[PDB]
């Protein structure tokens, strides 16, 4: 089997991407944030505290003939931005782009933090990291990809995120028309439950490539590119007027600037992030200070290849017995 679904930016900055997901019978379609940095599929629901729902579409398990309460199971999760949610669990039929999993754990939110309430466009998350990170207790649950894997033509999914444009998540096959050149594969460590890999270095603009190992995660659920302070300083030093602002919470730059590209290494191959991808717009409405899309990972504890990086590539998440990651230009 295979599946294919379009993923769409939630706003004009590509802050996140939503993908429609069919849950239950008859189908209830919710727009979920596919997140390769977490492993819970959770949704706004009829059980979510009323004051914490503001425009999202909810899953109502009582209206699904295939929903079953997973007795005794609860979940609770926190993300890198400090947001959180928690609740109980149902099993139900979940389909993505034509690919159907029965008995998928659908984690129903009783509580969500303000950041979720305030974002009307995201109805929940669909985790695509390794199932060892799933927060369901007392019986950990498998991700949608893990449940689908054995039925797929090939045990893979691919992320093809657009810049200010829709893109595609595919399951079970590699669309060879979707990228240019070849896909370069690189080793993955699953020790932390993430799609963790080591980039071979970087370049700033037309500058020379610096060969240096950068361990980080491929995380579709993080907006920006978070890299070591040395790397980030080297980037922003090429932008007149750019500075790290403690009050704003990262590097900012004059909105009048033209940003240089940023290249990262995948083995001997190179992925180029165009400078425009690194512009996240005014820090506040009407400001001439713009927020940078490359930021320091210092004090996150890990480097994160988020959407800024991933959207410059066609990315293969290879879930073979020994997982690997593949990157191609496009």
Curated annotation (Swiss-Prot):
Q: What is this protein called?
A: Endothiapepsin
The record places the active site at: 35, 199
One BP annotation, GO: proteolysis
Which Cys pairs does UniProt list as disulfide-bonded?
255-290
Q: Which keywords fit this entry according to its UniProt record?
A: Aspartyl protease, Disulfide bond, Hydrolase, Protease, Signal, Zymogen
Q: Which residues of the full protein are shown?
A: 90 to 419 of 419
Domain Peptidase A1 intervals: 17-328
User: Quick check: keyword Transmembrane in the entry?
Assistant: no
EC identifiers of the protein = 3.4.23.22
User: What reaction is this protein's catalytic activity?
Assistant: Hydrolysis of proteins with specificity similar to that of pepsin A, prefers hydrophobic residues at P1 and P1', but does not cleave 14-Ala-|-Leu-15 in the B chain of insulin or Z-Glu-Tyr. Clots milk
Which leading EC class covers this enzyme?
A: hydrolase
Superkingdom: Eukaryota
Q: What's the gene?
A: EAPA
Q: Which family does it belong to?
A: Belongs to the peptidase A1 family.
Source organism per UniProt: Cryphonectria parasitica (Chestnut blight fungus)
| Sample GO molecular function, one term | aspartic-type endopeptidase activity
